[model samples]
Target chain A: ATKAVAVLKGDGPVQGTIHFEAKGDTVVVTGSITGLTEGDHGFHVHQFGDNTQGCTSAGPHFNPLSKKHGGPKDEERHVGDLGNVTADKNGVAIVDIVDPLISLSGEYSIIGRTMVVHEKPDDLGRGGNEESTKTGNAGSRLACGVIGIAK
Target chain B: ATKAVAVLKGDGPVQGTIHFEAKGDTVVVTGSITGLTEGDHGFHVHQFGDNTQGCTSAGPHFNPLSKKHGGPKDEERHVGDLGNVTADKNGVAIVDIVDPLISLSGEYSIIGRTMVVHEKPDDLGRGGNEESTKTGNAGSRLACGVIGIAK
Candidate 1:
C-alpha cells in the first residue's frame, strides 16, 4: 500500500535514487546509482538519519533484533546488512534488491532512517575481524540519505 | 543483478505496469493501475502465461507449494495470493507489495507467470466456501499480463 524513495548524495561524484516497494513480508530495493569507481561498494541502512558527525553519526546498522553482522541473506545478520553492490564498467550500478526484513509502514519500518553507501565492499561480517562483526569492515561512507515515503 | 516488468492489458478500461525487484529472499511487487471502479480488486500471479482460454488458460494461482488461498500477509497463503488492491476515488491503484515467497530467479521464480486482477475483492480463503478456499471468490479477470525480464 505504501512505498519509499531516497536520494544518495556524496561530497564527490557519487549519486543515485533508491526506490522501495513491498509485496508481502519482502521489499524490493530498486533504482539506479551512478558515479561510482567501477567496483563493489557496501550498502546498508543505518540507525539514524543524522549526518551532524558525518555519516558516522548515523550510528551502526539498523539492528532491531539485536542480531550480529552478516549478509543480507544470512538469518543471523543485522537487518541493515545489505552486503555489496557492484558498479558496472561505466561506474553505474542498477539497484534491484530483495529483502525480507525491511518494512516501509509497519513496526520494522526503515523509514526516517539513513541509507548509506560505503567506500569499500562490505564483508557481510565475514571479514573475521572485530570491525567486521560490527560494521562488516566496510570503509568510510561514500553517500548517505534518509528514507522517505513516496506517494 | 536484474529486474522484470509486465504490461497489464484489459479488454475494458484497466491498464497498468507491474515492476518486480528482489532484495534477497524477498521480492518487491510495485507498480500502478488505472481505470478501476473505486473499490477493492483481487490480484494474483496465475501459473501459466497461456491466455488462449481468456485468462482462465493461465491456470490457478502460481502455487508451486500447492498452498491454499489466503491474504498476502498470511503465513499459510499461496505464493500468488496477493489479495486485494483498492482503487482510489479516481479509480487508480498504486502497487506496493513485499512478498518473501515469490522469486524473480532461482527455483520459485515467477518470471513467466501471469498476473491477473479480478473484478472483486478476494475472500482471502476465509469465506468458508469451496470457491473461497481455491479462488478466494475474486470473480472474473479484469486485467492480465505476462511477467517478463526487465533490463
Candidate 2:
C-alpha cells in the first residue's frame, strides 16, 4: 500500500514528520523529529481524527475495542499503545518501527487519526497510577498532527 | 524576523500548511491547502499551544483581551479571529494575506499557539446566533496545527 504521513509542529521549536507504510498485516512507522527534550516521549494515535478545536479534539487513545493501556507488545493494550520515541542529545528522534497491531488501510486505519508526542515518558500502564491505565500518564501533549495520505 | 509555521491535517483527507512572517506592525500569512470542500472555512489562532489533549485542549480562540468575535478587519475582534480560507473546486486553497495586530516574535506573538480550520464558513459574528459571539458559529474543527518557530 501507499505511504501515510503526519507533519508534526507544535508550540515553540518542535517540528517533524512521521510516516507509515503498510506491509502485509503490519505498518512500518518511520520519521525524523527535532526540537524535543532528550529522553523518551510518549507517542500514540488517538481516537477521532478531528482537528476542529485542537489536539484535544482528537479525543483519547484509539481504543475501538475498549482496551486498557499497555505497551506495544501487550496483548490487552489499546491499539494506540505504540509506546514512546526517545530523543538524543541534540533533541532529535529517529523512528523506525514495525507494528502488526495497526494498519494504514482498514476500518481501524490510522490515516486520519492524530499522532501526539508528550512532554514526558509513557508509563505503558506499568506503574500503578490512576491515569496510568487510561493515558499511560504521558503528561502534556507537546506536539501532534493528523496522519495524512502520502504518495 | 524569523518565520513561523502551522502544519494542518485532519480526519480523512484534509491537509495544508500555513505560515506567518512579521513585517512592520503586521504579519503576512501564506500557505496552500488541499482535500477540503469547495467553499470558505473558518480560520483562527487558538490560545493554547498544547496538543496533549488534542485541539479542544488548545481551547477557544486566542482571545487574550476577551473581546467579541469579528472579522480580521474588525476594530474589536478576538486576536484569533482571522476570518476564513476559501477552497476551490479542486479542493485547493492558496493563502497570501497580510495581517496586523499579530506578530511572529514579541510579547504578544502568535507563536506557540494553535491554528484551526473549521468545517463550515465563519459567520464573522455578523449573523445572529447563540455561539456567534464566541466561535463565529464556525462549526466543528476540520484541521489544525500548532504555530511553531521556523528558520
Candidate 3:
C-alpha cells in the first residue's frame, strides 16, 4: 500500500506524527499526538504543503472537488475534510479513521499538502450556520505539518 | 562534540536542512535550502521547539541572556540573532557560520528549540526602532524546524 506521513509541529505541546496508508478504495489515517487539551480537535487536510507562513500560508481546506465543508462520512465534502480527533486528560490524541475520498495518487492525491489540527471541534458542517458550512467554525490552528511521501 | 539537525519546511518550494555542531566554545551552524527567491532571508533560533501553531507558537527569538535583538556580531544581542541567509538565483541557500555565544549545553543551549527562516532580510536591529530591537523587523516566517540532537 502507498503511504505518507506528517511529522507535526506546533506552538503548544503538540507533537506527533500522522501516518496514511492507502488500502483498496480508502486511506487509513492513524497517529498519536501529545500536548493537546482534553477535547475534540478539528482535523483536516489543507490545500498547500508550505508551512513557511506557518499554517496560514498553507492555504484553506483542500477542496479540489469544490465541495462544502463536512466530515468523514459526508457524501458531499471537501477532499481534505477528515473530521475530528479526541484528546484525553493528559493532552494526548490518537487518530484512526478510514477515508474513501483521499489517495496517494491522481487528482485527489494529498501528498505535498498539509494537515492541520484546530483548537476547536469541527461542527461537521451540521452546525447550521454559514461559518460552519465554510470552515466548520474551527478556531485557531493548533498544529500543522507537511504531508510527505513515505519510503 | 555534539550535533543537531533541523529539517525545514516552507511554502513555494523552500525546503532543506540545517546542521549544528558544537566545537570548542562555539557552535557551527550550517544549512542548505532550495526554493527561495534569490535574496537574503532572516534566520534565528526560536524560544520553543513547538511548531503546533505553525512557527508562531515557537515564540520569539531565543534570548536566554535577555539581551536586545541585534546582529550576530553584537556584544549585546539575543542568543538567537543569527542575521540572514542568502540564496542564489537557483533559490538555494548555504549557511556556514561559527557563533561564539551559542552552544549545545548550559544556559545558552539551543537544543529542543526551533529554527526559523523569515521571508525578508533581517535589519540586524540596525533600523533604530522598537520593532527592530524586538524582532529585527523580519517579515513572515517562511520555514521552521525543530533542533533535534543528532547521533
Candidate 4:
C-alpha cells in the first residue's frame, strides 16, 4: 500500500495534514484542517508541484484527461477536481473519501502534484459564468501544499 | 526613486500585499494582511522566493549581515529580521515602517528575496533557547511571497 502526505501551512491559523492511501485502483484521502471561517472552501489538486509563487505558480487543475471542470463523481471532470471541504464553527474541517480517478502509479499519478485550498467555495462547474467551466470559479487561493511520497 | 512589492499568499485565509517604497536612504514598508487570528505572528525576509516546496523551500531567514537573530531595533540582527506583525480581532494586519537595515540598492538590496510570515510569535532572540538566537523559534511558515521591482 503506497501512501502520500501533505502538510499544509498558512500565514493564518489554517493548518492541517492530508493523507492519500492507494488501494488497488482507488485512493483513500483523509485529513483534517483548522483555521477556516466555518464554511465551505474550495479544494483541488493542481498540475505543478512548484508553489514558488504560492498556489498561483502551481498551475491549473490536474487534467490529464483534458476533461472539463466538474464534481468528483462527474465522468467528464478533471482528475484534480475533488470539490470542496466544509469547516465547522470551530474553524475545523475533516476530509475522508475514496477516489477512483486518482492513483499513486501510472500516467495519472498525483504523487508530485499540488493541493490548494481556496478562499471561496467551488461551484462544481454549475455556475453560469464562463470561468466556472474552467476553474469552478473558485476564488483566491488561501493555502497550498505539495504532495510527497510517504512511508 | 523606485518601489517594490510582494503579494503574500498562504495555504489558507492569510493573504496580503507588501510594498517597499524607496525614499532617500531608507525603504518605507506599508501593507495590510487579512485572515489572521487576533495575535502576533512572526515575520521575516527569507533567502529565496522559491515556494516549490511550499514555504519550507524559502530557506533560512535572510542574514547577509551574518548577525544573530534580533528585533528590528537590535544592534546585532539579521538584515531580514523585522520582527512580528500583530493582527486584530478582525483578522487584519497593517504594516508601516521605515527601516535603515534594508535597502533597495547596494549589497543589502532585498530584491529577489523572499518574505515569510510565521505561525508563532517571534521572541526576538530573547527566548533563552539555543535556537532563539538563531531563528527566534518562530514556528512553521504560514505565507510567503517574492519581492519584485515596482513602478
lDDT of 1 by residue, B49-103 (tens): 5444456667889887888889988887888888888899998988998888888
Q: Which candidate would rank higher by TM-score, 1 or 4? A: 4
* Candidate 4 C-alpha lDDT tens digits along B1-151: 1676777887878988898988888889999888887898888988765555767877888888788999999998899988999989998988887888888766787765678878888999999888999888988888887675554
DockQ-based class of model 3: incorrect
**Retained true contacts (fraction), each candidate:** 0.00, 0.00, 0.00, 0.00
TM-score of chain B of 1: 0.95
Per-residue lDDT of B1-151 in model 2, one digit per residue for the tens?
Answer: 3677787766657788887887788999999889989999888998765554556667888877889999999998898888989999999978778988778765667765778888889899888976998988888888777775554
Model 3 Cα shift for residue A92 (angstroms): 1.2
* Per-prediction TM-score to the true structure, in the order listed: 0.50, 0.53, 0.54, 0.51
Clash count list over all predictions:
13, 12, 10, 9
Model 1 chain A lowest lDDT segment of ten: A49-58
DockQ, each predicted model: 0.01, 0.03, 0.03, 0.03
Q: Could you list the iRMS of every candidate?
A: 16.1, 10.8, 10.1, 10.1
Every prediction's TM-score for the first chain?
A: 0.95, 0.96, 0.96, 0.95
Each candidate's lDDT (Cα)? 0.81, 0.81, 0.83, 0.81
Q: Which segments of model 4 are wrong by more than 4 Å?
A: B1-151
Tell me the tens digit of each residue's lDDT in model 2 across A16-122.
88888988889999998899999998899987555555676678999889989999989989888889999999999898889998888666777657888888899
